[PDB]
From a paper:
Here we focus on human [name], a member of the plastin/fimbrin family of tandem calponin-homology domain (CHD) proteins. [name] is a 70.8 kDa monomeric protein that functions as a key [name] network stabilizer, strengthening and promoting cell protrusions by localizing to lamellipodia and filopodia. While most cross-linkers bridge filaments through the dimerization or tetramerization of subunits featuring a single [name]-binding domain (ABD), plastins contain two ABDs (ABD1 and ABD2) within a single polypeptide chain, each composed of two tandem CHDs. They also feature a flexibly tethered N-terminal regulatory domain (RD) consisting of two Ca2+-binding EF-hand motifs, which inhibits bundling activity in the presence of Ca2+ while still licensing binding to single [name] filaments by unclear mechanisms.
After picking and reference-free 2D classification, class averages were analyzed by projection-matching versus the plastin-decorated single filament map. This revealed both parallel and antiparallel [name] bundles, thereby directly confirming that [name] cross-links [name] filaments bidirectionally. After 3D classification, selected parallel and antiparallel bundle particles were subsequently processed independently. These particles were subjected to extensive asymmetric 3D classification, uniform refinement, and finally multibody refinement in RELION 3.1 to obtain final reconstructions of both parallel and antiparallel bundles featuring a single [name] bridge. In both bundle configurations, ABD1 and ABD2 bind their respective filaments in a similar fashion, with CH1/CH3 both oriented toward the filament minus ends. As a result, when bridging a parallel bundle, [name]’s [name]-binding core adopts a configuration resembling a checkmark (Left), whereas the antiparallel bridge resembles a zigzag (Right). Superimposing ABD1 and ABD2 from the parallel bridge shows that both ABDs bind a nearly identical site on F-[name], confirming our ABS prediction based on the high degree of structural homology between CH1 and CH3. However, the two ABDs protrude at angles that differ by ∼25° relative to the [name] filament’s central axis, a finding validated by a contemporary cryo-EM study of the isolated ABD1 bound to F-[name], resulting in asymmetric [name] bundling by [name]. Indeed, comparing the prebound and parallel bridge postbound ABD1 conformations shows a striking rearrangement, with an ∼30° relative rotation of CH1 versus CH2. While this conformation enables both [name] engagement by CH1 and H1 redocking on CH2, it also requires a substantial increase in the distance between the CH1–CH2 linker’s N terminus and C terminus, from 5.8 Å to 30.5 Å. However, the conformational landscape of each configuration is distinct. Both the splay (mean = −1.0°; SD = 9.1°) and skew (mean = 2.4°; SD = 9.7°) distributions of the parallel bundle are centered around ∼0°, suggesting that the checkmark configuration preferentially engages collinear filaments.
Residue numbers in the entry:
A (entry chain A): 5 to 374
B (entry chain D): 121 to 240, 269 to 310, 332 to 377, 388 to 627
């Protein structure tokens, strides 16, 4: 039976077979609930929206994100999310198909245990596996040595891998990928006579961020250009009919990744995180780490993220040897493509978490099988 | 661009969901239309699906008779989708709000549950089932688990070889003849489960040469009857003195010993109710005349009336002589001319078995090592490598009684490869040197 690879994420959740070069599941991961009164009979008969079914009706509904930076709080909506991801984009039976799961690092044991039980009890799975997104994204670039910066919608972690081996003591996690960026953008959009409070405009704000916001090279120079000239002023067409125009709050939103002081947190930025991870590794393996910086996740596609990151790392470099930033075009699906490649291998068939072993092992079977 | 991409999906859904034929009033009924999306989004199939086992359930016209007024058609979708307790919409993400219109991915995900819960040697005998699949002309299914994946080709050939609990009756009708209906679950039958299907098809057609002992019959008459049966007589000779009274079998045997027969003087087996005895007497007289002058037989005191009246002595005196010429011809056509010998033909088996190499070598036909059928089966596959079949052979663990079975086993396929062996298994079990010689003579005919 063909293996299945599912890439879960706070904003986008991916699924597909093992071996395919193109993704299948392309949908926002949102939850909506009815909130208006139906004067006509036959309406109000839904518990929770999931994904594009709420995206297409984002006027009369709310938006709920059950995934909070890779943390699974309410499993009732996550059941719906996984049901959406699997049957609507695989159409195969997981009950007789192996499925490869993704999970953010530094995840408490309760989350992994519960997502394992859900697979082994709500579903009837013959053999599952749980893999780290950063490790899987390394196979997409065709390399086995170097750090991978996986930045989704609320998860930003750096797992350095050297010749297949990973360093547990050099693994950290940052909760700033796309969600706090969206919050910062919708907060700063109110400085131009705009109102952004309800979640019905959150998808529009995210789209505006995706098609306007870009990582700037020099923030002070961008401030000077925006204050003096008015050349970086691009307009957006609101779905209802009004026209907005933002020129300063475009490159301000992506700058929060490098400057955490905008949202007020004591953690460092994304450029210092990989440097600190490398510093936590061996001094004889930094050569393979500076020249191998594979980008992935839903965040790092801003127009000017690679050059800015290269400049930031070069400023942090001791001016000894070259820095290489890898930004593949399929950064949105590097994790899924790598998982499909790994599951397609003949070796990967011999450590899936089978149900018969789980029956006598117990809930902690994923903890030493993954 | 593309105007059509998925008409085959309609047929697939039909063959999968014929568990409930009432769903065919919502989904297309094999005419590849597009009625599925809107009505399935209303959940009508969910209430219909219960009619799989018992029709006494939510009726299609009882839950919905289209009192969905020309403005509000919003009442049927939630009313029918709330009855999704059966099978279970494992996609709990979707509500009846989005299913009001329907989405491709959502409909596919719900159809996934519909398909999943809606449904709950061997080859030598399988070919005796596949023989009828040819009909006018088409390929053969083989087992129900090998070639057919869906019900398309199976139903197409069922049109010629004519609820899954009742749709399995299509496969079981050829099994209901002997009562072998149960012990093969319809869910696995439709799903094409291999292991259940191989044995089920195999054991069915195991009963789809005559070696029996009559109450009164000498070994000589048994040899006669077996010889004529193995030579290919048009009737089936069961009694020597009751089937040769028409002299038709004798005439059939005549051309096989190179005696020309004029069939224009022979009365056909259809006999008028008047003068049939006269026609049979004429046939016997013509057979005697053909045996006398051009055939040079020694039959003193034998006439047509003796064969017509079934005189045992004179009939045996003719048949044994017929085999005398038949064996003479078999031993003469093998050589260059009119020479026949036993020592020239006894080392042939010793020489041709050295091509492969096996520990079977005989000195003559009187050796006791040919008491079992090991020597003949060692040679029967030397000429034809495709008949190895040592499954039923016995070597070193054979008693007096059990070697009859392997003797018959070795004799039976001799005609399969091409040796026109007219030998009883008993004559090979014993060390009768005259007729195992005929066995080897028939072997040499196909050998070279
Ligand atoms: N082209 C883009 N440029 C900038 N940001 C983007 C782009 N595409 C998506 N994003 C942002 O990234 C987040 C989506 O992350 P996601 O796709 O869930 O990551 P992952 O692939 O690791 O699961 C959303 O906030 C979205 O706004
Ligand atoms: Mg991700």
């Amino acid at each position: 039976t063909t293996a299945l690879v599912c890439d879960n994420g706070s904003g986008l959740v991916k699924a597909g077979f093992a071996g395919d070069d193109a993704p299948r599941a392309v949908f926002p991961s949102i939850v909506g609930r009815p909130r208006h009164q139906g004067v006509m009979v036959g309406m109000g008969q839904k518990d929770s929206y999931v994904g594009d079914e709420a995206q297409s009706k984002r006027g009369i509904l709310t938006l709920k994100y059950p995934i909070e930076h890779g943390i699974i709080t309410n499993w009732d909506d996550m059941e719906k999310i996984w049901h959406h991801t699997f049957y609507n984009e695989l159409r195969v039976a997981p009950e007789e198909h192996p499925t490869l799961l993704t999970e953010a690092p530094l995840n408490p044991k309760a989350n992994r245990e519960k997502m394992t039980q859900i697979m082994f009890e709500t579903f009837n799975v013959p053999a599952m596996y749980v893999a780290i997104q950063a490790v899987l994204s390394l196979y997409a670039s065709g390399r086995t040595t170097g750090i991978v910066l996986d930045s989704g919608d609320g998860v930003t972690h750096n797992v350095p891998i050297y010749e297949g081996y990973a360093l547990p003591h050099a693994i950290m996690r940052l909760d700033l990928a796309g969600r706090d960026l969206t919050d910062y953008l919708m907060k700063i959009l109110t400085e131009r006579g705009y109102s952004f409070v309800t979640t019905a405009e959150r998808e529009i704000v995210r789209d505006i961020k995706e098609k306007l916001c870009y990582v700037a090279l020099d923030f002070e120079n961008e401030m000077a250009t925006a204050a003096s000239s008015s050349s970086l002023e691009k307009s957006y067409e609101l779905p209802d009919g009004q026209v907005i125009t933002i020129g300063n709050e475009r490159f301000r939103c992506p700058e929060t990744l490098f400057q955490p002081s905008f949202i007020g947190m004591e953690s460092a930025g994304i450029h210092e995180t990989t440097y600190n991870s490398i510093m936590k590794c061996d001094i004889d393996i930094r050569k393979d780490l500076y020249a191998n910086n594979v980008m992935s996740g839903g965040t790092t596609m801003y127009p000017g993220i690679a050059d800015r990151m290269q400049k930031e790392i070069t400023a942090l470099a001791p001016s000894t040897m070259k820095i290489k930033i890898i930004a593949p075009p399929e950064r949105k699906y590097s994790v899924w493509i790598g998982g499909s490649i790994l599951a397609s291998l003949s070796t990967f068939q011999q450590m899936w978490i089978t149900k018969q072993e789980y029956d006598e092992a117990g809930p902690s079977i994923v903890h030493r099988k993954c | 661009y593309s105007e059509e991409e998925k008409y085959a999906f309609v047929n697939w859904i039909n063959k999968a969901l014929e568990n409930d034929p009432d769903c065919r009033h919502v989904i297309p009924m094999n005419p590849n239309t597009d009625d599925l999306f809107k009505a399935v989004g209303d959940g009508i199939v969910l209430c219909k699906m219960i009619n799989l086992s018992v029709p006494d359930t939510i009726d299609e016209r009882a839950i919905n008779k289209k009192k969905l007024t020309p403005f509000i058609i919003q009442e049927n979708l939630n009313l029918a989708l709330n009855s999704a307790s059966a099978i279970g919409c494992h996609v709990v993400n979707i509500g009846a709000e989005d299913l009001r219109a329907g989405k491709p991915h959502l409909v596919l995900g719900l159809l996934w549950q519909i398909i999943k819960i809606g449904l709950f040697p061997e080859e030598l005998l399988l070919r005796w089932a596949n023989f009828h699949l040819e009909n006018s002309g088409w390929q053969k299914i083989n087992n129900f688990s090998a070639d057919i994946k869906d019900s398309k080709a199976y139903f197409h050939l069922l049109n010629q070889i004519a609820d899954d609990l009742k749709r399995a009756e299509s496969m079981l009708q050829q099994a209901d003849k002997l009562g072998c209906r149960q012990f093969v679950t319809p869910a696995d039958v439709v799903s094409g489960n291999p292991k259940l299907n191989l044995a089920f098809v195999a054991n069915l057609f195991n009963k789809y040469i005559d070696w029996t002992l009559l109450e009164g019959e000498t070994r000589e008459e048994r040899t006669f009857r077996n010889w004529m049966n193995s030579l290919g007589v048009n009737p089936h000779v069961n009694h020597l003195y009751a089937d040769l009274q028409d002299a038709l079998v004798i005439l059939q045997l005549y051309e096989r010993i190179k005696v020309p027969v004029d069939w224009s003087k022979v009365n056909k087996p259809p006999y008028p109710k008047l003068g049939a005895n006269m026609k049979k007497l004429e046939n016997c007289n013509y057979a005697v005349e053909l045996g006398k002058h051009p055939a040079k037989f020694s039959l003193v005191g034998i006439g047509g009336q003796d064969l017509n009246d079934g005189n045992q002595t004179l009939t045996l005196a003719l048949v044994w002589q017929l085999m005398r010429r038949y064996t003479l011809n078999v031993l003469e056509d093998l050589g260059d001319g009119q020479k026949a010998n036993d020592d020239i033909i006894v080392n042939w088996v010793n020489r041709t078995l050295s091509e492969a190499g096996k520990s079977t070598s005989i000195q003559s036909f009187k050796d006791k090592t040919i008491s079992s059928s090991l020597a003949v089966v060692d040679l029967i596959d030397a000429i034809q490598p495709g008949c190895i079949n040592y499954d039923l052979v016995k070597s070193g663990n054979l008693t007096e009684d059990d070697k009859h079975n392997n003797a018959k086993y070795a004799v039976s396929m001799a005609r399969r490869i091409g040796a026109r062996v007219y030998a009883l298994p008993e004559d090979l079990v014993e060390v009768k040197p005259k007729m195992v010689m005929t066995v080897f003579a028939c072997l040499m005919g196909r050998g070279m």
